[PDB]
């Protein structure tokens, strides 16, 4: 799976300097940075703009009665007694 980027010099020389200060190859560093940003972008995602079909499907998700299946999971979550408790 090749990732080939055509960067600037005002860019790669910035990238190269910090790489050479954490002991990482230029390769292992732009990836560790892109992975860690790709992750935290995706994980820390708080604004959703839904259209009317999806928003109402979200609405239907909230109005939906709790199936015995899902309720028993809640019970499992609620009854567990954390070790600070």
């Amino acid at each position: 799976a090749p990732i080939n980027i055509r960067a600037k010099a005002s860019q790669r020389d910035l990238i190269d300097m910090a790489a050479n200060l954490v002991a990482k190859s230029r390769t292992d560093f732009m990836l560790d940075a892109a992975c860690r940003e790709a992750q935290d972008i995706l994980l820390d995602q708080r604004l959703f703009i839904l259209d009317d079909e999806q928003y109402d499907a979200f609405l239907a998700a909230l109005d939906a009665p709790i199936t015995a299946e899902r309720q028993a999971k809640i019970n499992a979550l609620m009854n567990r007694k954390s070790p600070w408790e």
Binding site: F48, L50, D52, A61, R70, K73, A76, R80
Partner: protein, 157 residues
Amino acid sequence: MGITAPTPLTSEHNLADFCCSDHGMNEWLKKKALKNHSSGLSRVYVICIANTRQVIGYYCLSTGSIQRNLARRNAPESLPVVVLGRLAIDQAWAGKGLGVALLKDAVYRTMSIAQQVGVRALIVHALDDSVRNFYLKYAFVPSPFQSLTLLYPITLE
């Protein structure tokens, strides 16, 4: 030989030991957790060894919104929602049940908030298929807008 209740992050808590399985959530605690939680963006919670400031696990909450596109009708319509950003438990303490233990605290705190303001679901992004299984196992349901996004609907009246 004990573990403490979750409590908001403080400048004191040693975060340098904690090493869960995912490099991402090790860097996020030690590099962005007090920068974020002190600037009221997200809000970080930590469990320590009985009497330490050694952090073993943490999670973070933050407000979110789910909104009705303006482009049936289009009148501006938002529901407030809380996003469970990250949950992570130190490898050496894995399997002791602290994972659920925190998620239960999150939900409890989130239904508590949802009594104050109108919060309508807790929301998590399962990247790993193992992550998704954990949250499905504990009453989250797949959202209908994103595959990797799950909801814990909390419709207090």
